[PDB]
Amino acid sequence: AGKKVLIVYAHQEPKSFNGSLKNVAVDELSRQGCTVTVSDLYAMNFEPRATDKDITGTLSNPEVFNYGVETHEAYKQRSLASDITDEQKKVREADLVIFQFPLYWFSVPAILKGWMDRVLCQGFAFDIPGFYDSGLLQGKLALLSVTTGGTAEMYTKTGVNGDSRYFLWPLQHGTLHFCGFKVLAPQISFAPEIASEEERKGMVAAWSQRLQTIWKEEPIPCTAHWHFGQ
Amino acid sequence: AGKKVLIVYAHQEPKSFNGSLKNVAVDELSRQGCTVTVSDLYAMNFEPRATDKDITGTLSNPEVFNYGVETHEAYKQRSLASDITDEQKKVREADLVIFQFPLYWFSVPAILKGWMDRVLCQGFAFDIPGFYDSGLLQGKLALLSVTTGGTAEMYTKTGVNGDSRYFLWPLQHGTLHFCGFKVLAPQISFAPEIASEEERKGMVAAWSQRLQTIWKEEPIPCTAHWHFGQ
Numbered sequence A, B: 001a002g003k004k005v006l007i008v009y010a011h012q013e014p015k016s017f018n019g020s021l022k023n024v025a026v027d028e029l030s031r032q033g034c035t036v037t038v039s040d041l042y043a044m045n046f047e048p049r050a051t052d053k054d055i056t057g058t059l060s061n062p063e064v065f066n067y068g069v070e071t072h073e074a075y076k077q078r079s080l081a082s083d084i085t086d087e088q089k090k091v092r093e094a095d096l097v098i099f100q101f102p103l104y105w106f107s108v109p110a111i112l113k114g115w116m117d118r119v120l121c122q123g124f125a126f127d128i129p130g131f132y133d134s135g136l137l138q139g140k141l142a143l144l145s146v147t148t149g150g151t152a153e154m155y156t157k158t159g160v161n162g163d164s165r166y167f168l169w170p171l172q173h174g175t176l177h178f179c180g181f182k183v184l185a186p187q188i189s190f191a192p193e194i195a196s197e198e199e200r201k202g203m204v205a206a207w208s209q210r211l212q213t214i215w216k217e218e219p220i221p222c223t224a225h226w227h228f229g230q
């Protein structure tokens, strides 16, 4: 009701549990009067590879390609590929960025990892200095909404997988806090394929219900202690 | 003697520090008489997206697409896409898989995340049962050779980045251990771009020297305690 939300969504099947979670977020944030945009990466055939195709201008060093140096220069010159600048405009305008995905290998699907690698370039999301609490997306909120195959109990300190917060570190800390975001507590929807039809319904509703009051939430302290203890 | 090694390499520029690390690994392992294969993912234009193109012929469930179910059934029915099956043949023959990459957002570059997501499928790399210590690639060694932009000091427990071990978790534990690899100690080449000249010529030589005795190494204990503990 005076806020813009971007949902960066990474699932191939609109009928999936991820699809239901993205759709309930759109329904409830639209109901509240928020402005909502969804980047549906598979439907966009979003390019995940970091390549020299991402810079259209004269390179700074055409003899030895360095993706970080070339994209930083490209951002400043306005010569990055348009798919990257299209996503940067959505991020720049958003007050909250929700990432909706299934956990692949304790991380994001590669199509979403390529969104982070290509969209969050130096100059746009961070600079040196200008990272962690001084990152360039300061003032914005981010939230990971993850689904898993593993049950909640597998994702505890003494379960097989270790605590769920452990796999969050490179994403919440190394990526989102690095860029200046404040991080809202993650939404983790555990083992929906194993769960009953009513259980999956309960998890979709629980997310809808959380979104009713998302603007009242405060972010986590995105530190080593929150993630690991000690 | 006799041993086979697969190097999965993820850098765009053959003249890079990563390139030099890959090329010294080829040179030294070939000198020792080992069988060496290199999957040069950018040069291959390797597909990182997990999509229904990864299954050939008719889908187990063509109304509701589930990548993990479809690719498990496809592996069993020898109907995965040829780029995937080509890589699984390389991994199946290998005794040691070396991943050579620059760290992107505390993790692998998306093109390499896509190799993990699409080659390490259920039935090939893991199953019920057959994970962690009993993963299906048990008997094989895996090793991360990672370059960073951050310095070793930045990568300490109280440093801005946290201990390196913290970002290694989803890769060493959640991916390589999970599939049954014994994980050799990562090779972490901290902050090459800012180093001399020498120092660099030298981190290459620590790696070539390490590789002289790689078959004598014992695997790390791939535990939460190794990654996070004291």
Ligand SMILES: Cc1cc2nc3c(=O)[nH]c(=O)nc-3n(C[C@H](O)[C@H](O)[C@H](O)COP(=O)(O)OP(=O)(O)OC[C@H]3O[C@@H](n4cnc5c(N)ncnc54)[C@H](O)[C@@H]3O)c2cc1C
Residues within 6 Å of the ligand: A011, A015, A016, A017, A018, A019, A020, A101, A102, A103, A104, A105, A106, A107, A147, A148, A149, A150, A151, A192, A193, A194, A197, A200, A201, A204, B066, B067, B068, B116, B117, B118, B174
């Ligand atoms: C490469 C790969 C790597 C993986 N790595 C990991 C990992 O590291 N750790 C881990 O724990 N897991 C991992 N997984 C498993 C993956 O995380 C889960 O399969 C995924 O999280 C489940 O989400 P989904 O949307 O695909 O579930 P779905 O299979 O779509 O959802 C379960 C069921 O919910 C139903 N559903 C959809 N909407 C609703 C609704 N509104 N109400 C009721 N039911 C509904 C669907 O019809 C479906 O039958 C991996 C999978 C792959 C393919």
Ligand SMILES: Cc1cc2nc3c(=O)[nH]c(=O)nc-3n(C[C@H](O)[C@H](O)[C@H](O)COP(=O)(O)OP(=O)(O)OC[C@H]3O[C@@H](n4cnc5c(N)ncnc54)[C@H](O)[C@@H]3O)c2cc1C
Residues within 6 Å of the ligand: A064, A066, A067, A068, A116, A117, A118, A174, B011, B015, B016, B017, B018, B019, B020, B021, B101, B102, B103, B104, B105, B106, B107, B146, B147, B148, B149, B150, B151, B192, B193, B194, B197, B200, B201, B202, B204
């Ligand atoms: C999206 C993105 C995300 C990133 N995220 C992170 C992150 O999370 N954390 C982090 O720490 N860093 C991050 N980085 C930085 C990245 O990890 C480093 O830039 C990379 O690791 C440096 O290795 P390189 O091969 O690319 O270096 P190069 O620049 O290719 O090498 C450094 C220098 O050594 C030269 N060289 C080549 N071969 C040799 C040799 N034989 N002997 C001596 N010198 C040689 C090179 O040409 C160059 O001058 C990120 C970069 C990008 C683009």
Ligand SMILES: COc1ccc2c(C)cc(=O)n(C)c2c1OC
Residues within 6 Å of the ligand: A105, A106, A149, A150, A151, A154, A161, B068, B121, B122, B174, B175, B178
């Ligand atoms: C491809 O599927 C995968 C891949 C990896 C995992 C991991 C690392 C932990 C886990 O609990 N589950 C369920 C997984 C899974 O689901 C079967």
Ligand SMILES: COc1ccc2c(C)cc(=O)n(C)c2c1OC
Residues within 6 Å of the ligand: A068, A120, A121, A122, A174, A175, A178, B105, B106, B149, B150, B151, B154, B161
């Ligand atoms: C895109 O580039 C990036 C992206 C991320 C990092 C992080 C998380 C820590 C770090 O120390 N450095 C240097 C980084 C970097 O450097 C260029």
Ligand SMILES: [Zn+2]
Residues within 6 Å of the ligand: A172, A173, A174, A177, A178, A221, A222, A223
């Ligand atoms: Zn943090």
Ligand SMILES: [Zn+2]
Residues within 6 Å of the ligand: B172, B173, B174, B177, B178, B221, B222, B223, B224
């Ligand atoms: Zn482990």
